[PDB]
Design a protein around this ligand. Structure first.
Ligand SMILES: CN(C(=O)c1ccc(F)cc1C(F)(F)F)C1CCN(c2nnc(-c3ccnn3C)c3ccccc23)CC1
Ligand SMILES: CN(C(=O)c1ccc(F)cc1C(F)(F)F)C1CCN(c2nnc(-c3ccnn3C)c3ccccc23)CC1
Ligand SMILES: CCCCCCCC/C=C\CCCCCCCC(=O)OC[C@H](O)CO
Ligand SMILES: CCCCCCCC/C=C\CCCCCCCC(=O)OC[C@H](O)CO
Ligand SMILES: CCCCCCCC/C=C\CCCCCCCC(=O)OC[C@H](O)CO
Ligand SMILES: CCCCCCCC/C=C\CCCCCCCC(=O)OC[C@H](O)CO
Ligand SMILES: CCCCCCCC/C=C\CCCCCCCC(=O)OC[C@H](O)CO
Ligand SMILES: CCCCCCCC/C=C\CCCCCCCC(=O)O
Ligand SMILES: CCCCCCCC/C=C\CCCCCCCC(=O)O
Ligand SMILES: CCCCCCCC/C=C\CCCCCCCC(=O)O
Lengths: 450, 454
């Protein structure tokens, strides 16, 4: 009925009355007028969002900020009706916080897209006071975000269910399956399963915004931070630790294949050699606070803002597992070449058929993992080689939108999809370790246990 | 001086401008000659900033010394100009711009005020103070405090180098019999402390400290690997950081060997032996070192005389030094406690086995491996406590450093790092090297060297 600008001024005016009021009747009346102006403001469409759908995320977030505000006005009203003026004034002072962190960005004029109005100085973009970078990655369209989300949902669900089956198959036969070198594939699978949970957490109701955005709607950058939720650092820890634990268990896989010949139980502190390196690296990223959120990937990761951190903590360790894993695979084929030439009557003897089965299967999984890890490496390499320029194009676009503006260059979502194909694909390929006639018997034995 | 200091300074600049722009090889030799004279008259002068100062004061002595290195570099450039090497004479003349700006300009009327120094390298400019960079010598510590630290590092580093080199030599002299677990773990620990000692001692070579810790423009090394700077800083960092990180991981292996060697006597557990934990021990420090180089957080420090991680930004020291050492204390500590539990269990379940009557060689090796492992834990813990003090206080020190530096542009130092905490760190760090090197101080070593003495 009334204009949004007037409704906003009614909120300002009545807030002044509450703080300089001596009685709860003046507070009650000011809050009642605020509740009316908040609800009517909720019905209005911000001037910036006239081209936007009423069911669009910007409009839904706009309306949500007033839902929080109306609840807080109602909380202040039960206090005022209790004759608690001091407490009602205190609750009313919290309306300023909500108005400024959630709604203000839709009533500004001070900031221009992709910048967003926020009173939080820790959220401000470089030297621009009062404005922070919007949570939604400004270099990619809503259509490119949604296409990417459907892509992660699909690949993430498939990897999650495949790896979960392999884990369930292993624990069902844990007495007979927890034996080296077979149990290496159990931990490889656990790594990609936990990793998938990390990638899939964004698909829960309102989870992507909780993970990737700051409470004031700006993008999560340089986490761990003060007065922000733990959702970002949790997703990063799940994704990054599982990713790094996965490439380390891959080296163990190549090592097991390289030593499967010298040999033809063994469950000791092997875990110390595998879980330590991703722990130290994860802890190092948390101490240097280079954890950032991203709306298109829907996760929190390292080196999204500053590419060097992705190069140091993702590219370089994966490059080292490739050269170490590659070494054990080459040495493994040389030993296979040696045993085939020097002793032709080893693979030509049926006496050790169980040795021939496990060694051939180990090598297949070892080389398959290597190929996918090499694709994963190449995509992080393209990103390392080009993100300095992309960061400059990001900053240049964001800045002339304040003072037509073009995006010179941007990250490639295709390269990201290839990386995810190879990353989730390792998880799906490694899960086929349990896709044998022997596991059909394990689930039959599990069914006959009731 | 016959001519004014500001007059001779203008002559020094004008000739330096007609060197890179000079169209004659004779003009290069002519401009270098006129500058040599202009510097010697400027050296005679007393800057108004130091007119209250005695002529034998540290300040006046450093002002004159600046003109000695300036004249000395002209001699290096005049011999190249006389040999017709125009490209080499102009390249050596750019090192004169550094000597003028970084060592002498602070005593004259100029753009910058100590601890800031004139630099034509924009990468060195401190914040919004255009044309000025932070001087290489740490402004928080005096020359005497620096000299006292350098003597301390020299004594501890030379002793740690010689002790570890003796232990490495003894192991390689009897390699067929010495290359055995858990004994050979002490050879790899010693190898880390030896290599690390070379890193710390590199600064004592002639003019090496300045090359390690300073930029070509005379400002301190920060955020290394830095473009168009020498690799001397990152080489020293890699040697010190990698050796430090490998050493504390080889310490975890030591505690592991102690626990599992006892476990192997009492239950189904393989000792130790043909196990390549080498993969973790060399990889974990490699992966950490490459991450630091990729995020370019290596910095130089004149008081330590090395390049290290997180000097400028304490969070990098916390993530790459404090957190890893803390992790080695919980894992190493865990294996030591488990090791004593197993030790008591063997003594209980196998009466008299670990004695001079029964398994005397196992008893003896397990006894000194435990004393070395508990001693090393104590030193690593002292090391951790010192890196923890630094982590807990550097956000303040960084703020005090910035506030002091900017105040001199447009005060007093509120707080600063503790050099005592650093000496205690170096005592326990080098002390581990010296303590772990005594593994070879037995009668059997005398026998090894007598048989090696042909
Ligand atoms: C960083 N990025 C920006 O846009 C951006 C944001 C802020 C900033 F200040 C400056 C910039 C920049 F422009 F870069 F300069 C992008 C974010 C999206 N994008 C992705 N990257 N990686 C992954 C991935 C694959 C495997 N594991 N992971 C984590 C990934 C996975 C799915 C979808 C997209 C992915 C490429 C890099
Ligand atoms: C960082 N430091 C500064 O002064 C400085 C410089 C620039 C800057 F922008 C801000 C600052 C400030 F904010 F002040 F911190 C100091 C450097 C000296 N100092 C040392 N620290 N550590 C070690 C050590 C022990 C074992 N291994 N190692 C590497 C060490 C060893 C010998 C002598 C000194 C050592 C304490 C910290
Ligand atoms: C383990 C996954 C938990 C991560 C937390 C998260 O994703 O947040 C969801 C949010 O609370 C939904 O509104
Ligand atoms: C392992 C021991 C962990 C101790 C390391 C401290 C944790 C840390 O480094 O993070 C704090 C952050 O750097 C604050 O600025
Ligand atoms: C290899 C298979 C992975 C390739 C992804 C295919 C895809 O979805 O296409 C990319 C899209 O056209 C651009 O964003
Ligand atoms: C355990 C290691 C604890 C090391 C002590 C560090 C510390 O807590 O000191 C605070 C400092 O003195 C404040 O000025
Ligand atoms: C400095 C530290 C000196 C190192 C002291 C350890 C040497 C030691 O006492 O060893 C035990 C002995 O071998 C038992 O027979
Ligand atoms: C573009 C070419 C660069 C990539 C090739 C890297 C070459 C590295 C050379 C040899 C690999 C050595 C790796 C060490 C494996 C030792 C493992 C062990 O046996 O314990
Ligand atoms: C006491 C033995 C020290 C040996 C140190 C040498 C090994 C370290 C390797 C490279 C360090 C590079 C620093 C050399 C400085 C160059 C000296 C100069 O020309 O000014
Ligand atoms: C000092 C420079 C550090 C960088 C690389 C060296 C890596 C150390 C390799 C040692 C392995 C020796 C071994 O095989 O036992």
């Amino acid at each position: 009925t009334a204009d949004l600008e007037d409704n906003w001024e009614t909120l300002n005016d009545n807030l002044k009355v509450i703080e300089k009021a001596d009685n709860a009747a003046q507070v009650k009346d000011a809050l009642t007028k605020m509740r009316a102006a908040a609800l009517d403001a909720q019905k209005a469409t911000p001037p910036k969002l006239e081209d936007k759908s009423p069911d669009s995320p910007e409009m839904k977030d706009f309306r949500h900020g007033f839902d929080i505000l109306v609840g807080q006005i109602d909380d202040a009203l039960k206090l005022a009706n209790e004759g608690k003026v001091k407490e009602a004034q205190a609750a009313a002072e919290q309306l300023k916080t909500t108005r400024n962190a959630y709604i203000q960005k839709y009533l500004s004029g001070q900031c221009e897209v992709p910048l967003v109005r926020t009173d939080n100085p820790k959220s401000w973009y470089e030297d621009v006071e009062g404005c922070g970078i919007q949570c939604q990655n400004p270099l990619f369209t809503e259509a490119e975000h949604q296409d990417m989300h459907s892509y992660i949902a699909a690949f993430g669900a498939v990897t999650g269910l495949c790896t979960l089956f392999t884990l369930a198959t292993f624990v069902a036969d844990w007495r007979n399956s927890n034996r080296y070198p077979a149990v290496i594939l159990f931990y490889v699978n656990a790594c990609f399963f936990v990793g998938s949970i990390g990638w899939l957490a964004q698909f829960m109701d309102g989870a992507r915004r909780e993970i990737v955005c700051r409470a004031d709607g700006t993008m999560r950058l340089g986490e761990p931070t003060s007065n922000e939720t733990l959702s970002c650092v949790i997703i990063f820890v799940i994704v990054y630790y599982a990713l790094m634990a996965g490439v380390v268990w891959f080296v163990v896989l190549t090592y097991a294949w390289h030593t499967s010949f010298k040999a033809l139980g063994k469950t000791s502190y092997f875990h110390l050699l595998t879980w330590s390196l991703p722990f130290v690296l994860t802890v190092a990223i948390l101490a240097v606070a280079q954890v950032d959120g991203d709306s298109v990937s829907g996760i929190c990761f390292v080196g999204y803002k500053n590419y060097r951190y992705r190069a140091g903590f993702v590219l370089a360790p994966i490059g080292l597992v490739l050269i170490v894993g590659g070494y054990f695979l080459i040495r493994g084929v040389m030993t296979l070449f040696s045993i085939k030439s020097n002793h032709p009557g080893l693979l030509s003897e049926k006496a050790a058929s169980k040795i021939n089965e496990t060694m051939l299967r180990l090598g297949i999984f070892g080389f398959l993992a290597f190929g996918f890890v090499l694709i994963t490496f190449s995509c992080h390499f393209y990103d390392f080689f080009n993100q300095a320029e992309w960061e400059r194009s990001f900053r240049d676009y964001v800045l002339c939108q304040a003072n037509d503006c073009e995006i010179k260059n941007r990250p490639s979502l295709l390269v990201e999809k290839i990386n995810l194909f190879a990353m989730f694909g390792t998880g799906i390929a490694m899960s086929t370790w349990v896709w044998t006639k022997a596991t059909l018997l394990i689930w039959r034995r599990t069914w006959c246990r009731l």
